[PDB]
Structures are given as structure tokens and as C-alpha cells.
Amino acid sequence: ERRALKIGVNGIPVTLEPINAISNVGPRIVNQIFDTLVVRDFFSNGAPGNGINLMPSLAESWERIDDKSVRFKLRQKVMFHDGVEMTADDVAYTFSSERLWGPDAIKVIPLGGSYALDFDEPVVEDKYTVVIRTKTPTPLTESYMASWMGRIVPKAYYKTLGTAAFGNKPVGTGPYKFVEFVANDRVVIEANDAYWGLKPTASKITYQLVAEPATRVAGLISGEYDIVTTLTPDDMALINSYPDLETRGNIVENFHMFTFNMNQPVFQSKPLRRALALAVNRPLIVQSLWMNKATIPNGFNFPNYGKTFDPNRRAMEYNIEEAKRLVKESGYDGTPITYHTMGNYYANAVPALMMMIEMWKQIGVTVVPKVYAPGGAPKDQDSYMRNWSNGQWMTDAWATMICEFGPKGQVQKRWGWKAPAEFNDLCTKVSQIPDSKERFDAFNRLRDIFEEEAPAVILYQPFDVYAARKDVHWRPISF
């Protein structure tokens, strides 16, 4: 009746602390260990899996009091996995200056400095009532609490261990509890029958790293795995020819890209970055590797942004004449430039890289692939080009143009992008006005600067495919 699930995955997070696990591979595991205050209804307003109405979870009800403050009334008798009852103190700690957004917290949780809202300290009104506050107005509080930033941690236990040690022995309120974590290999979680919500339907879940997608496909076919992730459209015909197996695929609110270590002199200025960007023939990559199912967005611009999505925005540019002109202008001396990829952690990362190496050879740039195994990522000083992705995790263009590429983000801080002052001033402005034609035009100006500066280059939104046994009716891969 409750089976032990075996999931063959593309990767394993570096930790199970819920914010530090934010990645393509962490949420599928941490969403089973932890809960949020509220959850998105992915099928509200007729949406086919990307709906946005908010529904109760750890909070049974909530009331926006003013433009800076939201009161949450918590469920009672919710138990953390170690038997401690969750209270307003735990929720307050989760969004506190100490743990999340203060100066010392940002050292151990870097996304607390860039992915946090402009929080002020939560207020605990009573055992089951907490008020989440912001120092400046924002309408995003409630939806933020359904996001990957909103997973609730146990104050006493987390504070005692600290962020890093908690990530190796996580305790949450979710339907599965931690058993084991072997870095670069596996995570095992087991049913928590003390869960406040629906009883878990699997006895145990094992997430096993299977680096190569053909090995994942073969393991599904042999019964070694019940579910496998991160496949491509090319795998679908073979899998679906087995009557006991099936695939599912769709465009995800995430883009694959490549980016630069702009602390390196070779990438300290925009010309060679933009040269590499203008030489990418995205329709050809999409045709050869994605069966024309991946979609190319019109800039850093996605429909989930709603009022800040521009459906009429122009396409991103492909111009090898300008690319060649920019290589010569940069003074590039033929010095090999590495491009680091952790295998096919991103679907089709290595075949797309090989096609782009040919494109860059045509404009006079020598790019060398540096394919590393999980756990072998280079030190920042040895990193030049690398691949990446960004999940568009809010119904607002603030994510990820601002939270990743803005003045508080990692692209400018860790990776050294010296953005124009106009860019950082507009990032500040859009975070102070409601949705209007003015806010709409400011995001389009940020998009234009992004394309001119090329701190990163958007490739496409992947057509994400997973596969499973038909008789496995619940799949904890957060698709």
C-alpha cells in the first residue's frame, strides 16, 4: 500500500537548509521536509499548473493589516519531526534579522541579502499569531510566503546547531522526515505519520544521483528507479513505448543561461561578453537538441510577471558581424577561456556547450570545456565562463532581474559585474511603485541594459521532462 520510492535525479543539493538548498535539485527534497505558511493553488483561475491564488498551510488564516504588515494565525499542535510544537516563535525566527536578513545572517545565507524582502523584525502576538513586517511597503509578502524562501524552521534546534550544521541534520514539519544525506550521492527521507496534513502515501523516498540521463532512462526501464528527472524530448518515444511507463513534459518558468566571472580581467568589461552573446544561434540549438520544444523568450521577460511581462518585446539579438567587431575591439589575444559545467546537471548542458564552442570558434574565440563531477566545482579565481539557470519564482519582474542581477545580488557582489548606475537606480525605483505604465517601462529599460552589458546570456526555457511508472501515482519531484 505505501511503497518505498526510488528517484533517479540529475543532482543533489549541497545542503538541506531550505534557503541554501535553492537550486534546480534542492526544492524537490526540501519541499517534503518542510512546510510554508501558505501555498499556491497551481490550478486556480483555470491555470494548467502555474496558478497563483494562495491557500492555507501552516497558517490557517491571514490578514494584511497595512502596506507593511501581515498577520498570520497558525495551526495549533503542528509538530516538528523531533516532537517540538511549532509556534509563532519559530515563524518569527525564520524571517528574523538573526537568521535571515541581518548582516551576520547574510554571511551564512547569502540569499538572505538578495532574495529577502525588505523585512523588519517579526512580532509575536501570542503563541499562534505572528505579524510579518517590512520596513517599506510591498504587496509581495503573502506570495513570498508560498515561495522557496518561506519554509519554516524550528527556532531552538536551528539556532543551537547554526545554519551549516542544521543543513546536515534538518528538522521540519513536513510529511517526510530526514534519514540520511551523502554529499554528491543521495538523500533518504521517511514518512512522518505525525504530519498535520494528509497522511504520507510513500513509506520512504530515496533521491539517488544518476549523473548520466541515459543511465536514468535505463534504470527506469529496469525497475531500479520508480521516477527519473531532467530528461529531454528525445527520450520520450522510447519511454512511452513501455506500457507501464510514461513521461510528462512542459515549459517551466526557468531559463538556462551562461555567465561570467567579471572579477577576471578578460570579463571585467562588456565587449567580449556581448561578443559571446551575439554569436549564439538559439533556434539552431533548439532544433538540434530540443525537438523545437524549448522556447526562446523575448528577453529577460516571462509571462508569469503579469503586469511586468511585455508580450510585444523584441527578440534577443544574433549578429556575428557585431560579435567579430567586438572581439577585435576587446584586444582578445587568443588565450583559452574555460567554460565550467557540472556534466548535464542542466539538461543538454554539454551538447549545447559543444555547439556554442563552434559558434565562438567562428568569431575568433577559443573556449575550452571543463566538465567537472559533483563536488569538483572550481574556486572562483579559476572560473571564467560557466552555465547557470534562474527560476522565475515570483509573479513580478523583481525576480530574478533584481534579486539576482541587482545591486544586492550575487552577479554584482560575488561575480563582480560593474553595472551602470542607471541600472541600479532603476532597480531601486521599481521597488517603490505599484504596477503602472511607469513600472512597465522601467523593467524594459533594465532589460535593454541587461542585453547591452551581457552579465549573463539567456539561452532558452527548457522543455523539462520527467518519467515514471504509471502505477506510481504521486511523484515528489516538484515539477
Ligand X SMILES: O=P(O)(O)O[C@@H]1[C@@H](O)[C@@H](O)CO[C@H]1O
**Contacting range for ligand X; rule: CB under 6 A; set: 232-240, 279-287, 369-377, 383-391:** 383-391
Scanning residues 272 to 311, which ones bind ligand X (CB under 6 A)? none
CA angle 375, 458, 407 (to 5 degrees): 80
Closest by CA to 251, choosing from 478, 25, 476, 460, is 460
**Contacting range for ligand X; rule: CB under 6 A; set: 171-179, 181-189, 365-373, 386-394:** 386-394
Whether the Cβ atoms of residue 8 and residue 222 lie closer than 8 Å to each other? no
CB of residue 216 to ligand X, shortest distance in Å: 17
Cβ-based nearer residue to ligand X, 154 or 409: 409
CB of residue 159 to ligand X, shortest distance in Å: 26
Regarding 196 and contact with ligand X (CB under 6 A), the answer is: no
Residue 71 CA to its chain's centroid (Å):
27
Cβ-based nearer residue to ligand X, 32 or 390: 390
Name which position in 87, 173, 301, 389 contacts ligand X (CB under 6 A).
389
Q: Which residues of 154-173 are buried (b: 16+ CB within 10 A; e: fewer)?
A: bbebbeebebeebbeebbbb
Q: How far apart are CA 227 and CA 466, in angstroms?
A: 7
CB of residue 58 to ligand X, shortest distance in Å: 23
Question: What is the three-state SS of 229-258?
Answer: EEECHHHHHHHHCCCCEEEEEEECCEEEEE
Name which position in 10, 147, 390, 395 contacts ligand X (CB under 6 A).
390
CB of residue 147 to ligand X, shortest distance in Å: 11
CB of residue 290 to ligand X, shortest distance in Å: 18
Cβ-based nearer residue to ligand X, 24 or 341: 24
Residues that bind ligand X (rule: CB under 6 A) add up to a total of 9
Closest by CA to 260, choosing from 142, 119, 96, 383, is 383
Strand bridging mode 367-371 / 385-391: unpaired
CB of residue 322 to ligand X, shortest distance in Å: 28
**Other residues' Cβ atoms within 10 Å of the Cβ of residue 317:** 13
Cis-peptide into 400, omega within 30 deg: yes
Cα separations in angstroms, 80 against 39, 86, 89, 173, 397: 19, 6, 13, 4, 34
Q: How far apart are CA 133 and CA 473, in angstroms?
A: 40
Question: What is the three-state SS of 4-55?
Answer: EEEEEECCCCCCCCCCCCCCCCCHHHHHHHCCCCEEEECCHHHCCCCCCEEE
Q: And the C-alpha cell for 110?
A: 547569502
Cβ-based nearer residue to ligand X, 22 or 105: 22
Cβ-based nearer residue to ligand X, 17 or 404: 404
Cβ-based nearer residue to ligand X, 138 or 254: 254
Q: How far apart are CA 310 and CA 312, in angstroms?
A: 6
Cβ-based nearer residue to ligand X, 17 or 90: 17
Name which position in 112, 175, 200, 391 contacts ligand X (CB under 6 A).
391
CB of residue 345 to ligand X, shortest distance in Å: 7
CB of residue 201 to ligand X, shortest distance in Å: 28
Cβ-based nearer residue to ligand X, 330 or 392: 392
Fill in the per-residue mask, 231 to 260: x = in contact with ligand X (CB under 6 A), - = not in contact.
-----------------------x------
Closest by CA to 476, choosing from 53, 256, 191, is 191
CB of residue 1 to ligand X, shortest distance in Å: 35
CB of residue 259 to ligand X, shortest distance in Å: 10
Scanning residues 400 to 429, which ones bind ligand X (CB under 6 A)? 404
Cβ-based nearer residue to ligand X, 208 or 389: 389
Scanning residues 15 to 74, which ones bind ligand X (CB under 6 A)? 22-24
Q: Which residue is nearest to ligand X (CB)?
A: 23
Closest by CA to 334, choosing from 369, 371, 363, is 363
Number of residues in the chain: 479
Q: What residues make contact with ligand X under the rule CB under 6 A?
A: 22-24, 254, 388-391, 404
